[PDB]
């Protein structure tokens, strides 16, 4: 979407994966979807390095809406958002952050809150701009394919007409199977800054693998369509939560990075471990995710040993390599060379291991190397030519 | 198997899951299958609390064998076990530990090492006894159903005839689909101390779930067959390795415990984290696993919320409850009561949370309680009548 926004993938925090539709503030005031939750997460983003490392969006998901007023104007739940959305936008902006919100192109949101029907698209866009929202995720429950086909472009046009830059995250393709012929990716790129292609992530490794598999199976279609201002979105990061081991957490971060994915966390920043913080705040990892060329990577090799290799092209003739072990036994000593991974010519390279920081220098195409990859884990290199 | 052994489930360490068939000692001397590996793990078991908490077996798995000598007697790989197996058993015994070994009922071991064919069953049994081995896992690759039907009983007979008590772990049912009519658990209980019923565990939560699912699906058949001296074996613990998160690690320990499973670790004890050690050395958990009644637990409740409840009966009218969340979203507040979990009227209970150590007092059948369970995680209770604390302190004794 040619609105000047998200020339690199968005980074931030989104409520949904970890906090879901918890509206029981009487019994669970610390974890319910409320003004307080968003304010506390904003404070953590401002104080604990997140904003400074690039995590700038703080996004509200489903279950925020209270009703519509006598003029049809959307309102938040008055008990859980007592000061209203402008207050929250203004608070988040005071901290150098951006505020995302959520609506559904349909009769109801997925959890049954008031929907943004076709006759409300313009009014709701105007309301969000007036509130000084910076991003909108538009979900697709409770609509027909024909409604979505009218509604997603209508919303893009309506947001534009407000005059406020609002990053536009579109769930449209996920409701239509994610693939041609039903999904037109050239159209999506013109109307959306990013789109959810596929199934909701859940807090499990099986879920990450399911998503990674679908993205790799369809990479010939998906890889070319991503670039500055228009991203594929394989859904939120699980790092900090319950289902992923340490190796798996590191793998998700590396693979999302090689895929030029959004880095949208969804975890309790108030209690996040040092180890998980260190994964998410890895400066080189973030540099790679945010590479200005915005070229999505692809799986380039899959071996009978169950080691997979991903490669992402980067600026200044650099590359990212992810060596990923699908094995479920023990560490594996993977032997390769840059020549076997389709680096050609007479270039000499240097690599930095993204997680260890160690430097491997003087790699020619014919130079044999070994990387030790743990099960359900990765080794990631930032590779560049040297003199 | 009525050989006096494993009146409670075996606890120890087995090389296979974590170290597999790594024989490259030239390139990987710290992690290859070798005497050094076993000696180092033995030291860790003796020094780091493992033995003292009940973990007594140190078990060799596949890929130890060098060949058979001119008389047909098994030899370990001379490059990787230079001092021989008797030396290793002596060493292990000197530390108050027991040595387990591995063979295959068939032409070759699964990894292609010399097999214990029907003609070698007796010689191999005698060799193991002579080496002062304490446990044998007998795998089932490269055999036919008839060879296994003859061989597993033949080995049990051969072990018995040596006069040395050797705990006998039988893979027979895993190679027969784990269920009647092909598997005869009455015979297995008479010839084996434990048996692998099902698929090899791998270092993944999916794997743990697949095994749990199978054991629960078939629990009406499997639960009654377990008891002192004859256990179901859902395979090794993954705690300490790569694939399980903290919640999943705590879950596997709890669920293996309620299933009266062996607690056979397979992890690098030299680098294991304090967090993982704390799971595996939890004293109340181990007490429950080792309960003298040896009654395997069951899944008693499954809810549309994807919360499952398992219960294991224990000594002194106590029970273990494991509340298990199959959810993949966020912590869940599970509301229940003992009456809804089929506890029978009038008894007042107390519970100790096995992981937090917290005590919950005044539980009657009707009293509503809430437990907070994390995704792919558990809450486990040790539950006892609050008349058994008093009665355990009013036992009168006399000399004789
Ligand atoms: C509502 O919708 C309109 C229409 O889509 C948006 O207006 C567009 O805004 C974008 C982003 O600001 C504009 O794109 C930028 O144009 C710059 C100048 O281009 C001139 O020359 C071209 C022909 O060569 C003309 O078409 C155009 O009218 C201009 O006169 C470029 O310099 C910018 O370059 C960017 O990309 C390159 C690499 O791709 C980078 O190197 C640069 O750093 C930079 O990021 C960019 O292309 C676009 O021109 C606007 N179109 C129109 C018709 O005005 C509104 O932004 C939008 N409003 C809201 C509130 O959402
Ligand atoms: C080869 O196979 C034979 C079986 O065919 C095995 O023999 C069995 O060995 C076990 C273990 O040693 C014996 O079990 C023990 O019997 C002890 C004595 O009981 C006898 O006497 C009573 C009289 O009241 C009879 O009723 C009974 O049938 C026995 O004949 C018990 O004292 C032992 O109790 C143990 O457990 C209790 C808890 O349950 C503890 O409190 C005790 O401390 C103690 O540890 C035990 O039951 C069994 O009797 C033998 N069976 C037969 C048929 O002889 C061999 O062991 C086996 N050899 C090898 C090398 O594997
Ligand atoms: C969304 O809402 C519209 C308007 O309420 C729904 O259309 C009505 O549906 C009811 C219940 O089936 C019918 O009895 C009415 O006759 C309909 N009225 C009108 C004016 O259309 C529609 O079914 C809903 N759409 C989706 C996708 O769920
Ligand atoms: C184990 O080894 C024996 C001995 O080689 C195998 O027996 C042969 O099997 C083939 C085909 O199955 C027959 O054609 C021969 O008649 C057998 N040879 C002898 C000398 O008996 C046996 O099949 C092997 N068993 C397994 C399960 O692999
Ligand atoms: C790399 O290793 C292979 C063995 O797989 C060897 O044959 C080859 O000569 C080596 N290449 C170089 C450039 O050293
Ligand atoms: C337990 O909770 C139920 C509803 O969930 C309630 O009806 C009942 O009265 C409660 N029982 C007790 C003993 O408080
Ligand atoms: O109900 C909210 C839920 N709907 C489905 C979306 O894909 C999720 O990310 C989340 O927004
Ligand atoms: O090859 C060894 C391997 N064979 C199959 C067994 O089930 C595993 O536990 C292991 O012993």
Swiss-Prot record, chain A:
Key word Glycoprotein present in the record?
yes
Q: Which residues are glycosylated?
A: 107, 160, 184, 342, 368
Keywords (A to Z) from UniProt = Disease variant, Disulfide bond, Epilepsy, Glycoprotein, Glycosidase, Hydrolase, Lipid metabolism, Lysosome, Phosphoprotein, Signal
Q: Which cysteines are cross-linked by disulfides? A: 21-63, 25-32, 110-141, 170-192
Enzyme Commission no: 3.2.1.49
Subcellular location(s) per record: Lysosome
**Catalytic activity annotated for this protein?**
Cleavage of non-reducing alpha-(1->3)-N-acetylgalactosamine residues from human blood group A and AB mucin glycoproteins, Forssman hapten and blood group A lacto series glycolipids; a neolactoside IV(3)-alpha-GalNAc,IV(2)-alpha-Fuc-nLc4Cer(d18:1(4E)) + H2O = a neolactoside IV(2)-alpha-Fuc-nLc4Cer(d18:1(4E)) + N-acetyl-alpha-D-galactosamine; a neolactoside IV(3)-alpha-GalNAc,IV(2)-alpha-Fuc-nLc4Cer(d18:0) + H2O = a neolactoside IV(2)-alpha-Fuc-nLc4Cer(d18:0) + N-acetyl-alpha-D-galactosamine; a globoside IV3GalNAc-Gb4Cer + H2O = N-acetyl-alpha-D-galactosamine + a globoside Gb4Cer
- Residues that bind substrate: 61-62, 137, 171, 196, 200
Q: Where is the active site?
A: 139, 200
Keyword field contains Phosphoprotein: yes
GO MF annotation list: alpha-galactosidase activity; alpha-N-acetylgalactosaminidase activity; protein homodimerization activity
**From its record, what is one biological process in GO terms?**
oligosaccharide metabolic process
Gene3D superfamilies xrefs: Aldolase class I, Golgi alpha-mannosidase II
Illness the protein is tied to: Schindler disease: Form of NAGA deficiency characterized by early-onset neuroaxonal dystrophy and neurological signs (convulsion during fever, epilepsy, psychomotor retardation and hypotonia). NAGA deficiency is typically classified in three main phenotypes: NAGA deficiency type I (Schindler disease or Schindler disease type I) with severe manifestations; NAGA deficiency type II (Kanzazi disease or Schindler disease type II) which is mild; NAGA deficiency type III (Schindler disease type III) characterized by mild-to-moderate neurologic manifestations. Kanzaki disease: Autosomal recessive disorder characterized by late-onset, angiokeratoma corporis diffusum and mild intellectual impairment.
What is its quaternary makeup?
Answer: Homodimer.
Q: What does this protein do?
A: Removes terminal alpha-N-acetylgalactosamine residues from glycolipids and glycopeptides. Required for the breakdown of glycolipids.
The miscellaneous annotation reads:
Alpha-galactosidase B was first found to be an isoenzyme of alpha-galactosidases, but apparently it differs from alpha-galactosidase A in substrate specificity and is alpha-N-acetylgalactosaminidase.
The protein's name in its UniProt record: Alpha-N-acetylgalactosaminidase
Q: Which organism is it from?
A: Homo sapiens
